[PDB]
Design a binder for this molecule. Structure first.
Ligand SMILES: Cc1cn([C@H]2C[C@H](OP(=O)(O)O)[C@@H](COP(=O)(O)O)O2)c(=O)[nH]c1=O
Ligand SMILES: [Ca+2]
Length: 129
């Protein structure tokens, strides 16, 4: 896998962000996670966490996996990095997302994320509280 450049257009919610990628706007859905909807418990906290992480970064990157790059809604499927730190992993490590939507052949970072989930659970953080 490799990181590619993008620029934030707009944080959307805990697991979606609108970035410009190769000069075109697109909405990215974070691989391998599920944050609560805004209307749900922890949903606002997830949205706020992702927003601050992407808005504060000097450098946003996208990393596609080995399989599907868009989902059925035309959303990009990627791991997103903010100054080198993976947003997907950070959300899981803080108990603000579950590991979810693990489809075969776009699951390169599954075990990293699962390791983070286990530690969030041990710490009884947020969703695990
Ligand atoms: C994360 C992810 C979601 N999806 C689709 C599955 C779900 O379809 P359904 O909408 O039919 O439930 C939907 C969940 O995304 P959200 O959690 O953003 O709603 O996105 C993928 O197809 N591939 C992915 O890697
Ligand atoms: Ca969601």
């Amino acid at each position: 896998l490799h990181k590619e450049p993008a620029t934030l257009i707009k944080a959307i919610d805990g697991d979606t962000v609108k970035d410009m990628y190769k000069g075109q706007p697109m909405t990215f859905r974070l691989l391998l996670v599920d944050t609560p909807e805004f209307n749900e418990k922890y949903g606002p906290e997830a949205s706020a966490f992702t927003k601050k992480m992407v808005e504060n970064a000097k450098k946003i990157e996208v990393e596609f996996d080995k399989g599907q790059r868009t989902d059925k809604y035309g959303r990009g499927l990627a791991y997103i990095y903010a100054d080198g730190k993976m947003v997907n992993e950070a959300l899981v490590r803080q108990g603000l997302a579950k590991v979810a939507y693990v489809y075969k052949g776009n699951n390169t970072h599954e075990q990293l994320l699962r390791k983070a989930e286990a530690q969030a659970k041990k710490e009884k953080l947020n969703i695990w509280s």
